[model samples]
Target: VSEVAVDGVVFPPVARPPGSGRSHFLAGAGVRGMEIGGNFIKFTAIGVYLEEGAAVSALAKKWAGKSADELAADAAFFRDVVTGDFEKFTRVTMILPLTGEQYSGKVTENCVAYWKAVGVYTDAEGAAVDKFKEAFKPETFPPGASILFTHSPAGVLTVAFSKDSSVPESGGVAIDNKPLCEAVLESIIGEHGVSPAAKLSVAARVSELLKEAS
Candidate 1:
């Protein structure tokens, strides 16, 4: 249970066995917040994780001779990340304290906007977005709740939940649709990311880790 504090929310430094395995390294961490009613309302503390073993192999020489700033600005690199066959966990810790509806709302809403902006908001993608909203509902998330979106190298996507900041033991819901899967992560790490602070913050540290892996 190693912890990395983000905006007072405790997120894991590595994947906990509850959702994905424990070996995934914490690639980066930051907060996505917005101004509402003159107060800065925080939504989630995001911790991005990636497998260190063979996962780095996908990033081989493509990353050679690049600095973190360079990596941050690399559109192809971020695009490849969402499209590549690398294990990932976009770990989200709640700060808004949403009911399942509100929580799932943020997820679906972000995906909706992302897909539409990218010009791929057809029924094929829309269908999966629908599935995600319902699948992600059914649980209330108070402050400190954690959600784990685990993406496997084989394109399988699974989501796990925690109630009191502890990782869930075993139960996870599978999200098998491809468009929805990529959309979910892309909302955070895509070129036109919704959560820019977290996305940009990650590139600096992730570049350091990716360099070591290379």
Candidate 2:
């Protein structure tokens, strides 16, 4: 059993699908996350549960025979197609199954901090990012986690955190991401007034895992 700690809480380690070279972890509080590794590249996302089989099958049919490299190069095209498919098939509002207590709290602070840390900003002229951040502060949601999608030359990664784990198998696809992983874990730890050492240790382990994979 793989294990990690968040806010003094020890949880089971992430589960890697056979031959996927990825790691997944779920929290006792119903939050689930994962990390995917690539050739000197990594992508990470964390939010709520997603219908993986449906999402990937749709992408496969739409981009039949296309390579991940080709898909990564065309961000606009990929986004357009994937976003549509996601909207059509992805389910984000559901609670994770087998979870204990749900975290029905606001995630604005976490989202703003994540975007800011990752340099996500609007292109509008004279746009006040601070105001946007402030605006998100009061927004609330069910007991769910945030979502993150990112990629690099090495590979693409996606993550979801939720109070439910009713996600279906992704057939054979792998979803993973990291920097955002740090941000989310830190956010959780911060909320509980925990030390940063846990996050650091997790990062260190990830680095080791990457090296092993390499």
Candidate 3:
């Protein structure tokens, strides 16, 4: 069992079953982590877990005989299964290669719309969310590079980017609600094997980002 340590917490790595196909994995502090497979992704965190395998297993059984592509194309059905009835799991974000039409260069505008629909932020808070969106510029990301979906009781944020993107290469800082950020950062550092020093640096950078937004 592969394991990683973060902030004094140790966690076993998330594993894919045999024949699960090529999947990406990220470890987080403790038992929290994530796995991404061709058809779906799963996330786990303190006090919350989204089991893609179990959910998808059930879904597959229910939608038996359907091809994977067929399942993916059905957005409504896919969303219902993927959410796993987890109320805190607020959103799903897919990052894909930028088609000329898709890359509007106004990523912030897109985020604002989603957040507004969710009713999670006030006018001022919405602006802060926009600041966070600016960190992810579509042009710099690579095709199918990373598809990330994050859920909090407050809301969910999903972003998909193609491979070879340089946007996240420099890294950025963000401050989430206290409990949420605490749980998330711990899991993230554990999964990614981030160094303590680096973690502090990122925190400082996030402070800068917040200051700039103000």
Candidate 4:
């Protein structure tokens, strides 16, 4: 049995969701805390995954001679991981109960903020983001339900939801626009992402993997 702990919450080590592509290793994990009604609420725990073979080669190819600490400190390396043409996954698990409406609203707010900050938010893109918001429906996910944001090798992102037991359906909500896809993933890996700890963790892990690959 393998797992990763983030803010005392537990999550799987590998992302091999059924009917998905190849399994991905857990690169890092962290929690998302929010202020609700002036109270601190731990909204969710998030984990980032990467295919080891691709990542090892990816890291070795550009950073073969770098030391673990060196690569961990290199912001550009993390930028490469986020924007590179490789597969990665961000798994966000609800820590507190929330209705689909509530989740969708927050996702919309953050996404719009990120898009504008990066100068990519347009009226057309806003419309597409609204479609994603509506994808939640009048659903409800108590603590433990999960939302999966998967980026394929081609960088196309698909968002899916799952029950606590882990079965994501609906064929995924796909975002085809390149910049939007990058921004969505960046919400977790970018400098402005919700979980900076997760990005740091991923950086540390990837750096470790490369140093040991020698």
Per-residue C-alpha lDDT of model 1 across residues 1-214, encoded as one tens digit per residue:
2356788876666664454564676766778777789987778888877776655677755775567788788878777777777777787788887677776777778777877998878886667666667766688777888877877766666778777666666847777767777766787888766567666766676666667665
- For candidate 3, write residues 108-151 as lDDT tens digits: 35444545677754665554544444545333423323323344
lDDT of 3 at 25: 23
Answer with 1 or 2, whichever has the higher TM-score.
1
Instruction: Indicate whether candidate 1 or candidate 4 has the larger lDDT.
Output: 4
TM-score for each of the candidates = 0.84, 0.28, 0.31, 0.83
Model 4 sits at a Cα RMSD from the real structure of 2.9
Best by lDDT: 4
Off by over 4 Å in 2: 1-10, 17-21, 24-106, 109-120, 123-197, 203-214
Model 2 weakest lDDT span, ten residues long: 41-50
TM-score winner between candidates 1 and 4: 1
- Candidate 2 TM-score over all chains jointly: 0.28
Judged by whole-model lDDT over C-alpha atoms, candidate 1 comes out at 0.72
Per-candidate local distance difference test: 0.72, 0.31, 0.32, 0.74
* Shift in Å, residue 134, candidate 4: 1.8
Model 1 ranges off by over 4 Å: 1-3, 16-22, 37-40, 113-124
